[PDB]
């Protein structure tokens, strides 16, 4: 099983990206699937999650209203689009697949990870 993140990149300060998570191995349309982020010198830290169940989707304050997290279960793949990027949005983005299909929104250690994507946003 494998998750891989694409569509990183750098990008001028207001513009936009679209990552994409594709995996194989395995159909994880019946888990719930999230993006993280690591910016340099930090912590790993939470972006969004996508429900398995429809239309169900969580966010971080920071990105809220900026960044929108959808699924296509036929590709196998989740998306982040990210909006109105600013400088503080610089990190390596990471998906994750839940360890347990069917899965509340209770915290679990994610059961899978990618190898991540950059994203430099710009001044
Ligand atoms: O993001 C994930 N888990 C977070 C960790 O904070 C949390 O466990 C969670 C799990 C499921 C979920 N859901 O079903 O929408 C939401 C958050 C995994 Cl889906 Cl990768």
């Known amino acids: 099983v494998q998750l891989v993140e694409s569509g990183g990149g750098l990008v001028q300060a207001g513009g936009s990206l679209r990552l994409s998570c594709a995996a194989s191995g395995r159909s994880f349309s019946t888990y719930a699937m999230g993006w993280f982020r690591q910016a340099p010198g930090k912590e790993r830290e939470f972006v969004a999650a996508?429900?398995?169940?429809?239309?169900?989707?969580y966010y971080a304050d920071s990105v809220k209203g900026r960044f929108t997290i959808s699924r296509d279960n036929a590709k196998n793949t989740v998306y982040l689009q990210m909006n109105s990027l600013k400088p503080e949005d610089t990190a390596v983005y990471y998906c994750?697949?839940?360890?347990?299909?069917?899965?509340?929104?209770?915290?679990?250690?994610?059961?899978?990870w990618g190898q991540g994507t950059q994203v430099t946003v710009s001044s």
């Open positions: 994750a697949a839940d360890s347990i299909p069917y899965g509340d929104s209770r915290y679990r250690n994610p059961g899978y």
């Open positions: 996508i429900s398995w169940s429809h239309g169900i989707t």
